[PDB]
Design a protein around this nucleic acid. Structure first.
Ligand SMILES: [Mg+2]
Ligand SMILES: [Mg+2]
Ligand SMILES: [Mg+2]
Ligand SMILES: [Mg+2]
Ligand SMILES: [Mg+2]
Ligand SMILES: [Mg+2]
Ligand SMILES: [Mg+2]
Ligand SMILES: [Mg+2]
Ligand SMILES: [Mg+2]
Ligand SMILES: [Mg+2]
Ligand SMILES: [Mg+2]
Ligand SMILES: [Mg+2]
Ligand SMILES: [Mg+2]
Lengths: 109, 139, 195, 145
RNA sequence: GCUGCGGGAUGAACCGAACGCCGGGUUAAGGCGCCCGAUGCCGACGCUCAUCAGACCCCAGAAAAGGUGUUGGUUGAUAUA
RNA sequence: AGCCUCGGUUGGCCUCGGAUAGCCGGUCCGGGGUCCGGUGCGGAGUGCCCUUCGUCCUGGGAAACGGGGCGCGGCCGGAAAGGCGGCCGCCCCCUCGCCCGUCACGCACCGCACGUUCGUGGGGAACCUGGCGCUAAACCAUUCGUAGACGACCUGCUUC
């Protein structure tokens, strides 16, 4: 029981001012607001979980409407605790302002 | 109003910086933005630190202005600041914060389990005290 | 899941920037008591700025032009909209997350209010600087409900005073009970791990 | 990760249970076990990178682990009678594995020695009974495990 | 012109830089309150209050003159007779 | 029972007000005096519910409110955009629901993902069953002109 992941918001892709890079995404993880605090989350897996109308097979249990996009944390971003990530497939633009759960599967400490 | 003052012989606490969490002694004021600090018995060398970097305390020591280390450490030991520093409600709160930060998983579990026993008895006694006060104010 | 931010004492732009950045993330923000938002500068200076803004208007059809609002909540809403990308679908969807309101209504009097110290006038402006209250500034230009706003604020304050008196009595009884049950409650763990 | 350390099983099918670590096998996987009386987890193989090690320690040096169990002792074997398709599910997964007298023997041999070491700690049998979880007030980058 | 790209909001000539299709790292010019990526640094010193403040080469606004409004400097003259 | 939607994985039930000042506690005559706390600990770097897998036997501390409510009565408690919470009298009953210790069990799925949550989520079409109630109004046609380019708008019909 109980939550086993950290909360993070999708603010946008890695971008300049007049161009975007959809391969890399930026994540604002709750509780981290400094550069010296994001070293714990480097390499952690991330999951963008959503629901569709057609049920798909799940690794455990009956098929469900849940669909997840997997990725992981690549490096840090800025000094305000923001972090970077790269998923198997680029995140849809509708996920901006939504939650990607940061797991703790790759454990170092 | 303004019960604390910087002066020759004021012991202050370093809130942030390279020597954060230590006490220093203000020898003299330099340029109304930084002051020379000694801190002989707190393991820090003589240097200049900004006023906004330090936090004032209540204890004051008798130093001559621009005094040497052999003359400031003697007065520090005469005032006996270190042992009386632990016997205050401020260093106790600081150490409490350090311990709460040093909490481990077993410690958090034990605290959570002790809260169940502590808060419930307090609540059941408050429920009795409130009814006692109501019965007292009833007539 | 909501952020009930108090309005009094906060600077207009200093608070609106924080709210506009926090709304684009997904947090539903409700700014309460917008009539107390202070604005830096002279009151006559801010009045002249607002009048120069009022002068701007489409010539051929004023109704189909810049809509000037008179309520301070709507003023703060327009200030936040000026920073949000309202011409895009993302900004349009984020604009509903912000709820600017005058006074403290029933749905929000019982909720504890938050204060953002990064926008407080005490830390933003020098004590010798002049500031203007958004409530008075709006009332001087086409706002009519300042009297009823102040009356309802007085009512809710007189209610919250009694609520706080009851809470303080409960706290006193709790401290008395804690001092009473000294035995049977050791809780050396609470002191060793510092609460 | 030292012999006698508490671990949290995050990615396993137990989803955040506290177990005791015994020893490291030869293939690189950790052989852990939780007291079946405390938490219903048998002698389980876990991964090193997939567990969180808590700073708590248990005196386990006198574990006296057997030598017959190894990486080959923990395997998943699947067999089927027919080659084509049929109604029954391979005649094997229908009646799940229930091998006994060997999975219970070593378990009863190890827990009767582990429990006298766990029950000596004042509040360890409840700590291991509990299940770890992330509440709203704390974050792992500030929490000390 | 024969020339895309990153900054100057906007752009023919400005500043960097020149161009096959991609992944990782870094950077020039420029920038880090929100539009919009990054100062959410317990940043340093000092100046400034406007009832027309000010905010970055080309670039999109201004002069002679004046201020007992403040902030520095120089030459000088008086004062325990 | 089935279909569409997209989002969350405990909730924070509240004095006003200043920043060259204020908080708490209180004998006395809303204010004054005194006593604690004051880089805020009666503190949101906070506090309560809490991190609980379940069932059974049996010991210590606490507990006389009992503990959940498809239940009843009294108050509307609160109008700026109100509906949950408290008290008292009973109701089917209840002293392992809390903390520590104790003998014995359960999906021990054999290393793995989309797991655990306010979901008796919002919306729409019907299916079998109980109790209490309802039996219309618009538009068109016609007429009127206080209005009308056409629409629109102002009005009448009863068998006395
Ligand atoms: Mg009008
Ligand atoms: Mg030509
Ligand atoms: Mg050429
Ligand atoms: Mg060129
Ligand atoms: Mg360009
Ligand atoms: Mg050049
Ligand atoms: Mg060039
Ligand atoms: Mg590249
Ligand atoms: Mg540069
Ligand atoms: Mg940004
Ligand atoms: Mg001028
Ligand atoms: Mg320009
Ligand atoms: Mg031009």
């Amino acid at each position: 029981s109980g939550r086993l992941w950290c909360k993070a918001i999708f603010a946008g892709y890695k971008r300049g001012l007049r161009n975007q890079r959809e391969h890399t995404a930026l994540l604002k993880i709750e509780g981290v607001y400094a550069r010296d605090e994001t070293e714990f989350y480097l390499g952690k897996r991330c999951a963008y979980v959503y629901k569709a109308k057609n049920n798909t097979v799940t690794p455990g249990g009956k098929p469900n409407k849940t669909r997840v996009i997997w990725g992981k944390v690549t490096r840090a971003h800025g000094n305000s605790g923001m972090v970077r990530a790269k998923f198997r497939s680029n995140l849809p633009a509708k996920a901006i302002g939504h939650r990607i759960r940061v797991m703790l599967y790759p454990s170092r400490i | 109003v303004f019960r604390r003052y910087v002066e020759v012989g004021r012991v202050a606490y370093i809130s942030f910086g390279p020597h954060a969490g230590k006490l220093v002694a203000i020898v003299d004021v330099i340029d109304q933005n930084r002051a020379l600090v000694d801190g002989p018995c707190t393991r820090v060398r003589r240097q200049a630190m900004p006023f906004k970097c330090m936090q004032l305390t209540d204890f004051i020591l008798k130093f001559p202005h621009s005094a040497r280390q052999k003359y400031v450490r003697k007065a520090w030991e005469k005032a006996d600041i270190n042992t009386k520093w632990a016997a205050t409600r401020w260093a106790k709160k600081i150490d409490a914060r350090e311990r709460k930060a040093k909490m481990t998983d077993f410690d958090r579990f034990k605290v959570m389990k002790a809260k169940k026993m502590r808060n419930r008895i307090i609540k059941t006694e408050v429920k009795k005290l409130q009814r006692a006060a109501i019965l007292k104010a009833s007539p | 899941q909501v952020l009930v931010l108090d309005g009094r004492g906060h600077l207009l732009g200093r608070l609106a920037a924080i709210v506009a950045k926090q709304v684009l993330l997904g947090r539903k923000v409700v700014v309460v008591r917008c009539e107390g938002i202070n604005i830096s500068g002279n009151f006559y200076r801010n009045k002249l700025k607002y009048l120069a803004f009022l002068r701007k208007r489409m010539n051929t059809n004023p109704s189909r032009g810049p809509y000037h609002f008179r309520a301070p909540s709507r003023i703060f809403w327009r200030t936040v909209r000026g920073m949000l990308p309202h011409k895009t679908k993302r900004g349009q969807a984020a604009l509903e997350r912000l709820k600017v309101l005058d006074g403290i209504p029933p749905p929000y009097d019982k909720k504890k209010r938050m204060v953002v110290p990064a926008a407080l006038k005490v830390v933003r402006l020098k004590p010798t600087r002049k500031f203007a209250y958004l409530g008075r500034l709006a009332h001087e230009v086409g706002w009519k409900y300042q009297a009823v706003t102040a009356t309802l604020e007085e009512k809710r304050k007189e209610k919250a005073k009694m609520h706080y008196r009851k809470k303080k009595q409960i706290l006193r009884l709790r401290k008395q009970a804690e001092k009473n049950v000294e035995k049977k409650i050791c809780k050396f763990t609470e002191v060793l791990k510092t609460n | 990760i030292t012999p006698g350390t508490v671990l949290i099983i995050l990615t396993g099918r137990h989803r955040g249970k506290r177990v005791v670590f015994l020893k490291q096998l030869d293939s690189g996987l950790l052989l852990v076990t939780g007291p079946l009386v405390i938490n219903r987890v048998p002698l389980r193989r876990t991964h090193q990178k997939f567990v969180i090690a808590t700073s708590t320690k248990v005196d386990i040096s006198d574990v006296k682990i057997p030598k017959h169990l190894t990486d080959a002792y923990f395997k998943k074997k699947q067999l089927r009678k027919p080659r084509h398709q049929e109604g029954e599910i391979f005649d094997t997964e229908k009646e799940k594995y229930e091998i006994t007298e060997q999975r219970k023997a070593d378990q009863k041999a190890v827990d009767l020695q582990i429990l006298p070491k766990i029950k000596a700690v004042p509040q360890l049998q409840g700590y291991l009974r509990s299940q770890f979880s992330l509440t709203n007030g704390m974050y792992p980058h500030k929490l000390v495990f």
